[PDB]
Amino acid sequence: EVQLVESGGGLVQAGGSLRLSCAASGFPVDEAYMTWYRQAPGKEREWVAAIYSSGYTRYADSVKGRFTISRDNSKNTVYLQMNSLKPEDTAVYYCNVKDYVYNTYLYDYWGQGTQVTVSS
Amino acid sequence: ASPKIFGVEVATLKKIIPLGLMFFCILFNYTILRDTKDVLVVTAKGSSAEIIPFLKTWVNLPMAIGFMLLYTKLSNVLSKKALFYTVIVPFIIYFGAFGFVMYPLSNYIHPEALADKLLTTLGPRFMGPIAILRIWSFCLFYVMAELWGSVVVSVLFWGFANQITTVDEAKKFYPLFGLGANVALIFSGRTVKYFSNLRKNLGPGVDGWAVSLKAMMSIVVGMGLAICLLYWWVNRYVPLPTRSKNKKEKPKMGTMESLKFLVSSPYIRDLATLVVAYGISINLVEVTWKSKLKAQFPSPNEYSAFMGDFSTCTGVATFTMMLLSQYVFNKYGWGVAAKITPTVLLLTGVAFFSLILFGGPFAPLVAKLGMTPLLAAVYVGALQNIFSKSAKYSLFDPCKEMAYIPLDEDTKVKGKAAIDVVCNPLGKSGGALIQQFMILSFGSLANSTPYLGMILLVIVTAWLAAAKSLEGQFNSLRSEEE
Ligand SMILES: Nc1ncnc2c1ncn2[C@@H]1O[C@H](COP(=O)(O)OP(=O)(O)OP(=O)(O)O)[C@@H](O)[C@H]1O
């Protein structure tokens, strides 16, 4: 069964770097459309980065240039390399794999999330 | 007393030699454009090999048709020489302007933002069709590169080679043009690799593919100018035959009435069936193989260098197969020769599909043989394509232009014209429409692998049970006349 387990979160200073891992179990990461979300308390969940089965990567305007999404096909893990971290990046980051056609979502599997907090 | 050199008349060497050299230059550009157009649409960011099924049917199929109506309308207001300067020169201008102007200015004209918005609102399985709008200028390059093999190779040259060579000259030297066409694959393959290797000179943001691309499009212009230069030579120094207007006031027999003729005559329906089956099945394997290629060589330059190596290997294999073709034929027969191409395509394709699909519980061989499963898939698909095409031009095309002989020269002349321009685009577009339905139903081309292998059996089974339906009509007409 599909399972997404995030790790690599923690407390870092402003301007630091952090790498989040998402060990996927039950599906190959190379043929999946996987995305990274984040949700700070008070605000709604915000989409951060998205990787496609083609290796194509998308990023939100808030994290373009600073964040980098990538996957390791051997270990079946997607990565979120967070660089130049701002205190605004403090949130719980979620690993998500899903497929959909227009507004019909065929499946939507989330992880439990990892807490990323940026001190100052 | 006519002089002779190498046992061949000197007067006919001034015609054949510049004709085979011009065929060499045409297949030299074709082997560069066909490798390049795969680099552009597959290795483009935001685009994968799944754009190919939608390029074949929704983009270059209407453009190839639209080109054949512009060519047909221009074939009445232009002379024969003016026709082979209005259809060949815009190609040279386009490819020269592409590698030097259009491609550099492609991050200026490609709507990457609008395509991304479409990609989110539609879904991950729509990256194929959406990439047509994402890299539309690369898609236009794909169409022009396709139109080079469809018009310059199939229409412009062979239309000119047939109007200047005698029927017996076209019987002795045409097999040598195909031999020289694969020398243009060995050399242009080495040419593509040489100009694909990333120069050690790095850049801040210098695209290693931009300097590589315009180093290829310069040769395309350079060799394209040789085609126009050789064509001018053969049309002023070579006395052409005086075959008069009496060629049945050639009535290109439309489209709907064309396939009406197809179904009417049982001899031509089977030949068209073979020509479309090779064109459905080859795509059914080749698009997935190019997906694996994109996985193995993400960089445009690595993909292009592999394409050059692949072109060289294809040229060598096809040269060998053309050499042994008139031993396979003479020994076994037209019926046996017409079966190997279906058989080689089926067997190589099912081996490649069973390495993609059933590759899980079989990997000590790829492990101890010093490869990854992805590289193994790349090499197996490369061997699949090499064997399929080296069988195509050495056994399938010989069988096709050997089955025409027992036909009457009216049915033959109309049917042979009806086969090429219909069945080749029709097969190459149906094999891609199948994959479009696969992609939009099962999501990805990899989820379509079990079925892509199963339509492969169905198409080949109807392909095998159409040569046997023709081995028995070829034998019937070729034996009763004796
Ligand atoms: N090695 C070769 N020898 C002779 N003719 C060739 C050779 N390669 C290509 N041609 C000619 O080029 C034309 C194109 O056929 P083919 O299907 O290979 O190209 P394509 O449709 O561009 O392939 P793809 O679908 O990969 O783009 C045909 O007229 C064929 O006769």
Residue B248 lies inside a defined structural domain of this protein: no
Q: Does A31 touch chain B (CB under 8 A)?
A: yes
* C-alpha span between B12 and B2 (Å, rounded): 10
- Nearest atom of ligand 1 to the alpha carbon of B184: 1
The total domain count for chain B is: 2
Q: Does A120 touch chain B (CB under 8 A)?
A: no
- Nearest atom of ligand 1 to the alpha carbon of B185: 1
Residue B95 lies inside a defined structural domain of this protein: yes
Same domain membership, residue B263 and residue B131: no
* C-alpha span between B414 and B261 (Å, rounded): 9
Q: Which residues between 34 and 93 in chain A have a beta carbon less than 8 angstroms from any beta carbon of chain B?
A: 52-56, 58
Measuring CA to CA, which residue among B77, B75, B27 is closest to residue B417?
A: B75
Residue B129 lies inside a defined structural domain of this protein: yes
Q: Does B295 touch chain A (CB under 8 A)?
A: yes
* C-alpha span between B121 and B430 (Å, rounded): 28
Token representation of residue B29: 């550009």
Q: A16: helix, coil or strand?
A: coil
Same domain membership, residue B324 and residue B180: no
- Nearest atom of ligand 1 to the alpha carbon of B286: 26
* C-alpha span between B121 and B133 (Å, rounded): 15
Same domain membership, residue B94 and residue B224: yes
Tell me the C-alpha to C-alpha distance, in Å, between residue B436 and each of B129, B280, B291. 9, 13, 14
Residue B245 lies inside a defined structural domain of this protein: no
| DSSP designation for A106 | E
Residue B312 lies inside a defined structural domain of this protein: yes
- Nearest atom of ligand 1 to the alpha carbon of B318: 1
Same domain membership, residue B440 and residue B415: yes
| DSSP designation for A43 | S
Token representation of residue B282: 């080859």
Same domain membership, residue B169 and residue B197: yes
- Nearest atom of ligand 1 to the alpha carbon of B56: 25
Nearest CA to ligand 1 atom 14: B149
Token representation of residue A70: 């990538």
User: Which residue ranges have their beta carbon within 6 Å of ligand 1?
Assistant: B 27, 30, 34, 146, 149, 153-154, 178, 181-182, 185, 318, 393, 428
Resolution of the PDB structure in angstroms: 2.7
Residue pair B317/B387 in contact by the 8 Å Cβ criterion? yes
Beta carbons within 10 angstroms of residue B76's beta carbon: 7
Encode burial over B109-121: b for 16+ CB neighbours within 10 A, e otherwise: ebeeeebbebbee
Tell me the C-alpha to C-alpha distance, in Å, between residue B314 and each of B104, B132, B196, B454. 31, 29, 18, 26
Residue B480 lies inside a defined structural domain of this protein: no
The total domain count for chain A is: 1
Same domain membership, residue B223 and residue B167: yes
Tell me whether residue B402 is exposed, middle or buried, using C-beta atoms within 10 angstroms of its C-beta: 0 to 12, 13 to 18, 19 or more: middle
- Residue to substitute from B48, B118, B126, B440, interface A, most A β-carbons within 10 A: B48
Same domain membership, residue B25 and residue B67: yes
| DSSP designation for A45 | P
Q: State in Å, rounded, how far the first CA of chain A is from the last one.
A: 40
Residue pair B304/B312 in contact by the 8 Å Cβ criterion? no
Residue pair B94/B158 in contact by the 8 Å Cβ criterion? no
* C-alpha span between B60 and B425 (Å, rounded): 9
- From A55's Cα to the closest Cα of chain B, the distance in A is 8
Residue pair A62/A85 in contact by the 8 Å Cβ criterion? no
For residue A92, what are the β-bridge partners? A39, A115
**Contacts for B467 with CB less than 8 Å, ≥ 6 apart:** B270, B274, B335, B338, B339, B342, B399
* C-alpha span between B351 and B345 (Å, rounded): 10
The backbone torsions φ and ψ at residue B456, rounded to the nearest 5 degrees and listed phi first, read -60, -45
Measuring CA to CA, which residue among B194, B197, B187 is closest to residue B299?
A: B197
Rg (alpha carbons) of chain B, rounded to whole number:
23
* C-alpha span between A70 and A57 (Å, rounded): 8
Tell me the C-alpha to C-alpha distance, in Å, between residue B258 and each of A65, B64, B195, B440, B479. 57, 17, 44, 32, 28
Query: Residue B341 carries which side chain, given as an amino acid letter?
Result: T
List of chain A residues whose C-beta atoms are within 8 Å of the C-beta of residue B298: 55
Ligand 1 centroid, distance to B428 Cα (angstroms): 11
Same domain membership, residue B195 and residue B55: yes
Q: Does B7 touch chain A (CB under 8 A)?
A: no
* C-alpha span between B26 and B43 (Å, rounded): 25
* C-alpha span between B263 and B173 (Å, rounded): 34
- From B146's Cα to the closest Cα of chain A, the distance in A is 24
Residues B158-164: contacts with CB under 8 Å, at least 24 apart: B160/B84, B160/B231, B161/B19, B161/B23, B163/B80, B163/B240, B163/B243, B164/B15, B164/B19, B164/B234, B164/B238, B164/B240, B164/B241
List of chain B residues whose C-beta atoms are within 8 Å of the C-beta of residue A102: 121-123
Same domain membership, residue B305 and residue B435: yes
Residue pair B341/B395 in contact by the 8 Å Cβ criterion? yes
Q: Does B110 touch chain A (CB under 8 A)?
A: no
Residue pair B299/B456 in contact by the 8 Å Cβ criterion? no
Residue pair B430/B287 in contact by the 8 Å Cβ criterion? no
Residue pair B195/B215 in contact by the 8 Å Cβ criterion? yes
Q: A40: helix, coil or strand?
A: coil
Cβ contact A100–B124 (<8 Å): yes
For residue A51, what are the β-bridge partners? A34, A57
Experiment type: cryo-EM
* C-alpha span between B92 and B217 (Å, rounded): 9
* C-alpha span between B233 and B228 (Å, rounded): 9
Residue pair A35/A50 in contact by the 8 Å Cβ criterion? yes
Encode burial over B158-182: b for 16+ CB neighbours within 10 A, e otherwise: bebbeebbeeebeeebbeebbebbb
* Containing structural domain, residue B147: 1-239
Q: Spell out the SS3 assignment of chain B.
A: CCCEECCEEHHHHHHHHHHHHHHHHHHHHHHHHHHHHHHHHHCCCCCCCCHHHHHHHHCHHHHHHHHHHHHHHHHHHCCHHHHHHHCCHHHHHHHHHHHHHHCHHHCCCCCHHHHHHHHHHHCHHHHHHHHHHHCHHHHHHHHHHHHHHHHHHHHHHHHHHHCCCCCCHHHHCHHHHHHHHHHHHHHHHHHHHHHHCCCCCCCCCCCHHHHHHHHHHHHHHHHHHHHHHHHHHHCCCCCCCCCCCCCCCCCCCCCHHHHHHHHHCHHHHHHHHHHHHHHHHHHHHHHHHHHHHHHHCCCHHHHHHHHHHHHHHHHHHHHHHHHHHHHHHHHHCHHHHHHHHHHHHHHHHHHHHHHHCCCCCCCCHHHHCCCCHHHHHHHHHHHHHHHHHHHHHHHHHHHHHHHCCCCCCCHHHHHHHHHHHHHHHHHHHHHHHHHHHHHHHHCCCCCCHHHHHHHHHHHHHHHHHHHCCCCCCHHHHHHHCC
B215, B239, B263 - which closes a domain = B239
Q: A30: helix, coil or strand?
A: helix
Nearest CA to ligand 1 atom 20: B146
CATH number at residue A66: 2.60.40.10
Query: Residue B14 carries which side chain, given as an amino acid letter?
Result: K
Nearest to B123 among A54, A55, A100 (CB): A100
Same domain membership, residue B277 and residue B214: no
Cβ contact A54–B47 (<8 Å): yes
Rounded to 10 deg, the angle between the B136-147 and B10-42 helix axes is: 160
Cβ contact A56–B48 (<8 Å): yes
Beta carbons within 10 angstroms of residue B435's beta carbon: 27
Our mutation pick for probing the ligand 1 site, out of B22, B25, B26, B27, counting the most ligand atoms within 8 A of Cβ, is B27
* Containing structural domain, residue A56: 3-119
Tell me the C-alpha to C-alpha distance, in Å, between residue A76 and each of A5, A23, A30, B88, B404. 11, 6, 8, 50, 56
* C-alpha span between B261 and B467 (Å, rounded): 19
Same domain membership, residue B262 and residue B179: no
CATH number at residue B327: 1.20.1250.20
Token representation of residue B38: 């795969």
B239, B268, B287 - which closes a domain = B239
* C-alpha span between B306 and B295 (Å, rounded): 13
Ligand 1 centroid, distance to B393 Cα (angstroms): 9
Token representation of residue B418: 């009806």
Same domain membership, residue B467 and residue B358: yes
Query: Residue B27 carries which side chain, given as an amino acid letter?
Result: L
Tell me the C-alpha to C-alpha distance, in Å, between residue B116 and each of A57, B353, B456. 10, 31, 34
Torsion-angle region of B209 (φ positive above 0: left; ψ -120 to 50: alpha; else: beta): alpha
Cβ contact A55–B46 (<8 Å): no
Measuring CA to CA, which residue among B63, B51, B207 is closest to residue B115?
A: B51
Residue pair B403/B334 in contact by the 8 Å Cβ criterion? yes
